[PDB]
Amino acid sequence: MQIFVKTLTGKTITLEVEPSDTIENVKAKIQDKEGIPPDQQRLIFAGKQLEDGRTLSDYNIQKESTLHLVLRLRGX
Amino acid sequence: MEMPICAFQLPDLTVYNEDFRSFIERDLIEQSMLVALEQAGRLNWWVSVDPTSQRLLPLATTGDGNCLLHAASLGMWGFHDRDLMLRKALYALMEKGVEKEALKRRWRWQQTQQNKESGLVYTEDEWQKEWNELIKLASQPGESLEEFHVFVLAHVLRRPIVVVADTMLRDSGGEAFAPIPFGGIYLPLEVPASQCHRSPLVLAYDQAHFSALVSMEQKENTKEQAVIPLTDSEYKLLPLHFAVDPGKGWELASVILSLEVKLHLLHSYMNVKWIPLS
Numbered sequence A: 001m002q003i004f005v006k007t008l009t010g011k012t013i014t015l016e017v018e019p020s021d022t023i024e025n026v027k028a029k030i031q032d033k034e035g036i037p038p039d040q041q042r043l044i045f046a047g048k049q050l051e052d053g054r055t056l057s058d059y060n061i062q063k064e065s066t067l068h069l070v071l072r073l074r075g076x
Numbered sequence B: 001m002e003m004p005i006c007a008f009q010l011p012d013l014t015v016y017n018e019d020f021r022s023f024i025e026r027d028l029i030e031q032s033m034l035v036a037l038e039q040a041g042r043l044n045w046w047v048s049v050d051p052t053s054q055r056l057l058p059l060a061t062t063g064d065g066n067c068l069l070h071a072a073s074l075g076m077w078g079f080h081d082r083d084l085m086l087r088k089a090l091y092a093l094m095e096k097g098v099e100k101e102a103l104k105r106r107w108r109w110q111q112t113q114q115n116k117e118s119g120l121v122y123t124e125d126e127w128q129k130e131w132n133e134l135i136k137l138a139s140q141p142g143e144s145l146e147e148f149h150v151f152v153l154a155h156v157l158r159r160p161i162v163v164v165a166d167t168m169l170r171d172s173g174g175e176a177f178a179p180i181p182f183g184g185i186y187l188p189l190e191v192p193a194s195q196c197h198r199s200p201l202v203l204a205y206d207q208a209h210f211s212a213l214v215s216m217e218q219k220e221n222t223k224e225q226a227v228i229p230l231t232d233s234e235y236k237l238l239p240l241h242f243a244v245d246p247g248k249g250w251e252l253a254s255v256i257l258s259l260e261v262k263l264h265l266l267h268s269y270m271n272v273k274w275i276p277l278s
Helices: A023-034 B017-025 B031-039 B067-072 B082-095 B100-116 B124-139 B147-157 B253-269
Strands: A002-007 A012-016 A041-045 A066-071 B002-008 B056-058 B161-164 B168-170 B176-179 B184-186 B201-206 B209-215 B226-229 B273-276
Touching: A012 A023, A023 A041, A066 B176, B031 B056, B031 B201, B056 B201, B067 B082, B067 B147, B067 B201, B067 B209, B082 B100, B082 B124, B082 B147, B100 B124, B100 B147, B124 B147, B147 B161, B147 B184, B209 B226
Parallel strands: A002 A066, B161 B201
Antiparallel strands: A002 A012, A041 A066, B002 B226, B002 B273, B056 B209, B161 B184, B168 B176, B201 B209
8 A cells, every 4th residue: 555754844755555564664665765764763643653663554554644754863 | 234153263282283283184075065065055155245254164074983973072182082982971961960850851842842843742751762762872882963962062062062054854856855953053051151161163964974164274274263153044043952941941022032042142152253244
């Protein structure tokens, strides 16, 4: 399935995922697109910060669902 | 119209300063950072509007140390493990010491405001976990550092830090992607101003890299002092990082109050000079 990831600026990205995929996998897919390392990423859905270990199905994330991405940038 | 600036200089070693300055003179510049920040209009925009200002250039990092710590530890030139020692002090300050509770409140308060932008609300356990990660990053040698670490570093040095940076990360399309948090002024606010150095450490940030900024006069050892603006290119006062400890109290009236407080804090910790725009 395809889900959307949205930044504070409103920038939107589409990702091909399965419900079984972990949050780490999603972040890794985001890095493939944007080059930001996973540990400098935070994913938010339904007002909650997603934990790297859990899966998308664990958070009721579905097709055409929109996740929010905020960064914790580091220098180096 | 007026604009605030402040002088800065490289450290002066009490021994082997000539040798140190020779290494500075033979240092390479971080070309990618210079090009990116100048084109984005963040670096050296002042050269045109202020004839007596100097073009500032980012020094390339040397050795295995983290680029931020290496840039900040030039005063310890001659000691190989200077980056490692600076990291221990930064970690020690967060983990121990008198001001760690106030530092933590400042971090949490700013992060809390940031969280509101995403409808996110941390539990106490989440606050503890996020804080633990900041400690872990500071404890591990070679690891890159965050905005708050720069703030703590200002306290370790007991010196203001000024970071030149762009405001937004942008994508392959060139569209804005996400904010860059590093640009601005970092004051040692938990340290009494009487015990602080007033001349700032001046840095630039670009593409996950920190670099110390110097003029060509400083780099060639012809002149000690250079100048750095305390505003952006639109003459807005640079952001003041982690400026509020809620443990010390908190509140156009609101915005203007934040502006006057900033000016008073700059006056307390820095030697600001005001010059006309040419």
